[PDB]
Amino acid sequence: RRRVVITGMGMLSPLGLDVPSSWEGILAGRSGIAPIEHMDLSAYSTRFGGSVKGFNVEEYLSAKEARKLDLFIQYGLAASFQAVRDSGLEVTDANRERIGVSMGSGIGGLTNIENNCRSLFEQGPRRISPFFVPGSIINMVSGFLSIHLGLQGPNYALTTAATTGTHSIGMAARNIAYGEADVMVAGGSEMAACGLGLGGFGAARALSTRNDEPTRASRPWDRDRDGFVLSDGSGALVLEELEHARARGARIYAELVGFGMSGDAFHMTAPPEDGAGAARCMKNALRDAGLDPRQVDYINAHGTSTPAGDIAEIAAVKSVFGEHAHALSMSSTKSMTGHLLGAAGAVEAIFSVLALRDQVAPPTINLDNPDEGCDLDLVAHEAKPRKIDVALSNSFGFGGTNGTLVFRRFA
Amino acid sequence: RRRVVITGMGMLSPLGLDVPSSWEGILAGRSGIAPIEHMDLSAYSTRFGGSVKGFNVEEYLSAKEARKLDLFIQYGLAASFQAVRDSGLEVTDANRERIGVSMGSGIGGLTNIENNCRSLFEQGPRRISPFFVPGSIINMVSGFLSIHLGLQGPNYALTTAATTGTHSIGMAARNIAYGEADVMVAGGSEMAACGLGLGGFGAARALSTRNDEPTRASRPWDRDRDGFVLSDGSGALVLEELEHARARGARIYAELVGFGMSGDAFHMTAPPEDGAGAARCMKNALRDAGLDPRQVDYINAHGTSTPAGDIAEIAAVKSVFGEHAHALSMSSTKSMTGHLLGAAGAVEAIFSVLALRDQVAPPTINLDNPDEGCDLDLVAHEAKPRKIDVALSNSFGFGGTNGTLVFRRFA
Numbered sequence: 112r113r114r115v116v117i118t119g120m121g122m123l124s125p126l127g128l129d130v131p132s133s134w135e136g137i138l139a140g141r142s143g144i145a146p147i148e149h150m151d152l153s154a155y156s157t158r159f160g161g162s163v164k165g166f167n168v169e170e171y172l173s174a175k176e177a178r179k180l181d182l183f184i185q186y187g188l189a190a191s192f193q194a195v196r197d198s199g200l201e202v203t204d205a206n207r208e209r210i211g212v213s214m215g216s217g218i219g220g221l222t223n224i225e226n227n228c229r230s231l232f233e234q235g236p237r238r239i240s241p242f243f244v245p246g247s248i249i250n251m252v253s254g255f256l257s258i259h260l261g262l263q264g265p266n267y268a269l270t271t272a273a274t275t276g277t278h279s280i281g282m283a284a285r286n287i288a289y290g291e292a293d294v295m296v297a298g299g300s301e302m303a304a305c306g307l308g309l310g311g312f313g314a315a316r317a318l319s320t321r322n323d324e325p326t327r328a329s330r331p332w333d334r335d336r337d338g339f340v341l342s343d344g345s346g347a348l349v350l351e352e353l354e355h356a357r358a359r360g361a362r363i364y365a366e367l368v369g370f371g372m373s374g375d376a377f378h379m380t381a382p383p384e385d386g387a388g389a390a391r392c393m394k395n396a397l398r399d400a401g402l403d404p405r406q407v408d409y410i411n412a413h414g415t416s417t418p419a420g421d422i423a424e425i426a427a428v429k430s431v432f433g434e435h436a437h438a439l440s441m442s443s444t445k446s447m448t449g450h451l452l453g454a455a456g457a458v459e460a461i462f463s464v465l466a467l468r469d470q471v472a473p474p475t476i477n478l479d480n481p482d483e484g485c486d487l488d489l490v491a492h493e494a495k496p497r498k499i500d501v502a503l504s505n506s507f508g509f510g511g512t513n514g515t516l517v518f519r520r521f522a
Numbered sequence: 523r524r525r526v527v528i529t530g531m532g533m534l535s536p537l538g539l540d541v542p543s544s545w546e547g548i549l550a551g552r553s554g555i556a557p558i559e560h561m562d563l564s565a566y567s568t569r570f571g572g573s574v575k576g577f578n579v580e581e582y583l584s585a586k587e588a589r590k591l592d593l594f595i596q597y598g599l600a601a602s603f604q605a606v607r608d609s610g611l612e613v614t615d616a617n618r619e620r621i622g623v624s625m626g627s628g629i630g631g632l633t634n635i636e637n638n639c640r641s642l643f644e645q646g647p648r649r650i651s652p653f654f655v656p657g658s659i660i661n662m663v664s665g666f667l668s669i670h671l672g673l674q675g676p677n678y679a680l681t682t683a684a685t686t687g688t689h690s691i692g693m694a695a696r697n698i699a700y701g702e703a704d705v706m707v708a709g710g711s712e713m714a715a716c717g718l719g720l721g722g723f724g725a726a727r728a729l730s731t732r733n734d735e736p737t738r739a740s741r742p743w744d745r746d747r748d749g750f751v752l753s754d755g756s757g758a759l760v761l762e763e764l765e766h767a768r769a770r771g772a773r774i775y776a777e778l779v780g781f782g783m784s785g786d787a788f789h790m791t792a793p794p795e796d797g798a799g800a801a802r803c804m805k806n807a808l809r810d811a812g813l814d815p816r817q818v819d820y821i822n823a824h825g826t827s828t829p830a831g832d833i834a835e836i837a838a839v840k841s842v843f844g845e846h847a848h849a850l851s852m853s854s855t856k857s858m859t860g861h862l863l864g865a866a867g868a869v870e871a872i873f874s875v876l877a878l879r880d881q882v883a884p885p886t887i888n889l890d891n892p893d894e895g896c897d898l899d900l901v902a903h904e905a906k907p908r909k910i911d912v913a914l915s916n917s918f919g920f921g922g923t924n925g926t927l928v929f930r931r932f933a
């Protein structure tokens with residue numbers, strides 16, 4: 112089985128329009144959460160979220176091309192273009208069949224759907240945009256990236272709710288490991304802040320309603336948590352076979368050593384109280400990496416700020432790591448970014464890789480009063496410089512679909 | 523030890539095809555910035571700039587000669603011919619060895635290089651013009667001017683990015699001071715508005731992207747500034763030893779009393795936040811002039827409309843001038859002209875000399891909301907008649923290369 116390394120990273124998040132600006136916010140404990148400006152939400156129970164501020168699509172695409180694409184596609188292409196530039200890779204006739212794309216989304220083009228739905232109900236079907244389908248379907252980040260850069264390798268898209276970015280990266284790594292590609296651009300994107308998004312998650316009572324203090328709403332493992340915060344953006348990584356990277360003198364950030372999956376097979380939105388599914392998934396990833404639990408230094412948690420979810424993840428980490436659960440550091444960067452849904456696993460993979468580069472555990476902000484049994488090192492309030500050789504990233508999605516990635520300092 | 527005065531000036535700018543037309547625009551607060559007409563930029567993130575409008579090279583050169591020369595050389599020769607005519611100097615066998623030229627450029631013949639590169643890639647090397655080298659190299663403004671007018675004195679060219687025009691004038695003044703010339707034609711020219719120029723500065727994210735309001739894009743010290751505006755043109759001055767000027771009854775505009783240089787030694791494109799390099803450079807120029815900071819009445823700023831640059835220049839002016847920083851007037855004429863790069867220091871030297879002639883500080887247009895700490899007299903919006911005995915002109919360039927000129931009312 113071939114080794115897979117990370118040679119390029121790209122991002123849009125509520126904290127920044129690139130990786131270095133986002134990471135500066137993470138290490139400073141900055142919130143990207145604010146009242147939403149782009150629609151009137153006076154009728155909604157949640158009126159805040161994590162928006163991308165000041166995005167200029169014309170840095171990436173012509174105004175002509177951009178007009179045809181939903182925001183989630185613009186965001187996915189921005190992160191992908193950043194990652195490919197960051198990698199330094201040159202695409203040629205000799206390698207274009209060996210370079211593929213796996214960029215996913217949880218909910219896809221809900222804004223475009225809403226806008227075309229308005230035209231349809233008011234004025235009938237002949238008002239629908241000709242670009243409605245190709246500019247809204249989830250696989251068009253992978254499609255449009257492949258067309259723009261001439262990538263002819265495996266071309267697909269995952270949609271697994273909060274697990275999307277984690278599955279996208281893990282399965283792209285499998286393509287490289289088993290020899291069906293040498294390079295993959297993998298990750299996810301999301302822009303679900305429309306009436307149907309805030310209204311839909313609101314109707315399921317999944318969202319924090321702390322409208323008076325939006326920056327305090329996302330509070331993983333805190334006793335006063337009341338649901339997740341909806342956020343927008345994108346993450347992309349260039350995954351590359353090790354000898355391919357070495358041959359061209361690529362800068363290597365870290366090694367992707369492990370990928371695990373499981374299903375809870377329990378409930379449509381609630382985890383089992385002991386997080387048994389999450390425990391199996393983390394053990395599967397560590398076994399894939401050939402690592403003992405005692406070798407893990409940092410966990411980037413799922414940690415969405417939900418009553419049932421946050422405590423199930425603690426139970427799963429205690430089950431897998433035993434006494435070592437009190438030696439590792441675990442934090443939820445969703446305390447600062449909110450929940451990017453299909454992009455969460457992509458941006459959190461990048462944060463896990465930068466924790467390895469910079470030897471620092473990002474904080475869990477807003478952890479004022481840890482709940483019953485939440486007695487691990489959850490890196491409350493402030494970043495913690497420490498030794499990190501192995502970093503684990505968890506994603507648990509609606510339906511009980513679980514994914515874990517394991518990254519290692521490269522040697 | 524000899525005194526140096528200005529006896530002739532010439533210009534092409536986005537505001538006019540000569541000095542008086544350009545200065546009328548400056549004092550009226552007119553913008554020279556517009557959507558670019560000479561190429562299709564529909565695919566670029568910046569689609570506007572400061573173009574020279576209605577330039578006729580046949581006013582200066584035969585069609586034969588002009589066809590051999592890049593636009594930046596045509597522009598440099600136009601300004602130089604204007605300055606020499608303006609000075610009234612007669613070139614003879616008795617003085618031609620005592621008259622030299624120092625005309626520079628930041629980027630030089632990028633248009634010609636791009637056009638010859640197209641021929642080379644499509645049709646191979648025998649399609650390259652025989653005039654490609656002598657018609658594109660930066661020293662051919664000095665070369666062609668010397669041949670056309672029979673000037674046999676010191677003959678050279680500076681290339682120091684945004685500092686080019688300032689270094690060119692200061693070093694020409696040193697030649698006269700030290701006795702190696704009695705007259706120098708000095709300044710700079712630029713025409714970087716080709717695909718490689720807009721594309722190159724765009725790729726570095728150095729340019730404003732305010733395509734919806736081009737005349738509002740250049741907004742030095744304004745909280746909503748987002749990078750510089752690329753502009754084209756040329757400036758030339760006839761510098762002359764004082765007794766030489768007096769003897770022939772020359773009209774004297776002003777005295778060039780000081781020239782200072784420094785390097786930031788900090789970063790390739792960013793200044794130090796406190797502008798320590800700019801402060802050393804201004805002090806060096808004042809020490810050269812034998813002036814105290816309290817004697818400065820007007821500063822023509824570098825003021826390019828960049829986030830880091832504009833606030834560094836304020837810090838440097840506060841450091842050098844102390845309480846007097848609130849008594850002098852400082853403005854950026856790039857608010858109107860945009861950034862002429864290698865020509866910026868030449869056209870801004872001319873504006874500093876005319877501020878002395880006319881006793882008026884040109885405005886900083888578009889200064890709607892001055893940023894934190896930008897609380898000096900920045901001559902917002904409208905020209906300000908006032909007493910000006912001493913005017914300073916600043917230029918700070920890529921690489922941290924700094925130059926300052928000091929001009930005085932002549933007595």
Ligand SMILES: CC(C)NC(=O)c1cc[nH]n1
Binds near residue numbers: 389417423508509511
């Ligand atoms: C999103 C739901 C189904 N899952 C969890 O919150 C969770 C926590 C631990 N294992 N699973």
Ligand SMILES: CC(C)NC(=O)c1cc[nH]n1
Binds near residue numbers: 918
């Ligand atoms: C062009 C860059 C390198 N320099 C400045 O903008 C600047 C401002 C004050 N000192 N330096």
